[PDB]
Design a protein around this ligand. Structure first.
Ligand SMILES: N[C@@H](Cc1ccc(O)cc1)C(=O)N[C@H](C(=O)O)[C@H]1[C@H](O)[C@](O)(CO)[C@@H](O)CN1O
Ligand SMILES: N[C@@H](Cc1ccc(O)cc1)C(=O)N[C@H](C(=O)O)[C@H]1[C@H](O)[C@](O)(CO)[C@@H](O)CN1O
Lengths: 319, 319
């Protein structure tokens, strides 16, 4: 038993684990409970969010469980990770409006509603309670400043000033992990490179609060185009997984006009084909580039997936 | 948490449980490990085997696990359940040949190969070992004759004589359940009406051997045609889920020419639609019978499933 660890590292989806061996272990023994999340900083996800939520499927595939968290709380604050400009808060309706969009997509990418499947959580439930005096007593006590001033994320901000709220974000997200680690049994936190800091911060506080209850962190990598030009950025800014911002036809194309270099890879990253199917599909590429098979299947795979069987047609029938 | 128990009894898939409440319970608490099996008495399954193995999916759907057992051992003996004529043994090649067929179908109906998914077991592994003196000591001791002479199955046989082997079958199958109950954690045994006796017999010996380690038995019902004529029996004897004995076109038809009375039901029994989709699909039936929607979708559902997306086409394109 250890095939899942096998394809996630063939397909190259492993940027870093906190404790390699430890993760390798429980994955080949117990049925883990890994989760991922996103704040409602928009009313639609974008292909940058496609990789991480798929890796959650990869896991679910072999008996494991995935938990999808929507930032109904940490959303209103926003994650300075990466950013090198302070954010700007947003209207209670704005957030509570956005989550209606993001939730409509997840619900389609994953299967919510079972007796023991994935779960959709919103942190405004546990962060919506906890008070000012409280937060300071119960959590702040064992969350030292030298540590926070250590998070890579923060410096870009420390450099041209980081407001206190951007600064008290990591503690908001640590509280989360812990809550799930103690509430749904969560032990692994999957997320992009931009989440190393927050992930780790979650386990560091899990240890202080009570000798780290078997928690670990996994990071999916950074999808890199071949030419060195921003995966996910069209003139039409991003490439939105929302039909009416980025359509199946526009969607379709994006994957079929995708370069041959960064092609098989993307096949591994976003398709549920096997090493065989790809092997062959890598072949058609390597010697009969005219039929343009790679670029084609990829497309029709991710499109039927994201957008539909029929809309795939509709898209193709417009091609 | 209790939706699965909800649709299995809406769709009517529950003929009987050994301990109703007890099953209701662990199903709304822990992720069960239910299994089902079939002896290689042929090299292809038939629609009579479609219901039970689907109900295993129903379960797997909500976090649970299914184990598919092939009778590589109890096969060579054959289950007198139902039968009212002694069986006839069969060639070691014959069995070892048949299982190649039956396994090719399961592998397509279920997903074998994961870190923690369903598992394919063959009992010739645990029954292939156990010796004559042994079997008598370790198992026979606490397997009283008055009990066996109680199994409904047996009397039909007791009436026109039951050979000892048909008689020592139930103990072969009890040993199984137990082995899985102690080996893979199995707690529920799903199978058709014709398996009540064997199922129960498995838990009765599990208790004697050691206070029944939390085992229960579930039975799917008997698919009944509307007219009262043998579901699954064509002139072409059965309706084989093997392409080259019962083809997608022949397959296709069988479901589209299926009567309107026993139609929505069969929709519930064999399709993964919702109560909604069916509601509507029950409607089209009830007032626009000309479009013949029920009979149609059913077909194309079960066909794409059993035989393929493309072969569905091929079938339709021959319709
Ligand atoms: N603080 C997190 C959100 C979070 C919310 C609650 C938690 O308890 C832990 C983290 C974040 O910044 N997420 C990105 C987002 O937009 O929501 C998102 C990124 O955009 C990403 O590319 C795909 O979602 C990858 O970094 C994974 N991420 O969660
Ligand atoms: N003794 C069982 C097989 C068995 C094998 C190993 C076990 O440890 C327990 C039982 C039997 O008779 N099965 C049917 C078959 O043909 O294999 C089969 C029936 O045909 C059925 O209709 C669908 O498979 C339903 O009764 C479920 N059944 O298992």
């Amino acid at each position: 038993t250890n095939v899942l660890i096998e394809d996630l590292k063939w397909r190259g989806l492993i940027y870093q684990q906190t404790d390699e061996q430890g993760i390798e272990d429980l994955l080949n023994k117990e049925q883990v409970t890994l989760y991922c999340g996103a704040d409602p900083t928009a009313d639609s996800l974008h292909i940058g969010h496609l990789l991480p939520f798929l890796t959650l499927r990869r896991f679910q595939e072999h008996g494991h469980r995935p938990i999808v968290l929507i930032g109904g709380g940490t959303g209103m604050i926003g994650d300075p990770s990466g950013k090198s400009e302070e954010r700007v808060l947003q209207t209670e309706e704005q957030v509570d409006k956005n989550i209606e969009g993001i939730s409509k997509q997840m619900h389609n990418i994953f299967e919510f509603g079972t007796d023991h499947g994935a779960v959709l959580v919103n942190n405004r439930d546990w962060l919506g309670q906890i008070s000012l005096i409280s937060f300071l007593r119960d959590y702040g006590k064992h969350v030292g400043v030298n540590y926070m001033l250590g998070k890579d994320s923060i410096q870009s901000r420390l450099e041209h000033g980081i407001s206190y709220t951007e600064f008290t974000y990591t503690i908001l997200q640590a509280i989360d992990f812990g809550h799930l680690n103690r509430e749904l049994n969560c032990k692994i936190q999957v997320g992009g490179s931009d989440q190393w800091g927050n992930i780790t911060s979650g386990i560091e506080l899990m240890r202080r609060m009570y000798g780290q209850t078997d928690a670990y962190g996994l990071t999916i990598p950074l999808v890199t185009k071949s030419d060195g030009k921003k995966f996910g950025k069209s003139e039409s800014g991003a490439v939105w997984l929302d039909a009416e911002k980025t359509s199946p036809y526009e969607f379709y194309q994006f994957w079929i006009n995708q370069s041959d270099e960064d092609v098989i890879k993307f096949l591994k990253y976003f398709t549920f084909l096997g090493k065989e199917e790809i092997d062959r599909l890598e072949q058609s590429k390597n010697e009969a580039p005219h039929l343009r098979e790679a670029q084609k299947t990829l497309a029709e795979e991710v499109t039927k997936f994201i957008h539909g069987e029929d809309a795939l047609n509709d898209a193709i029938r417009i091609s």
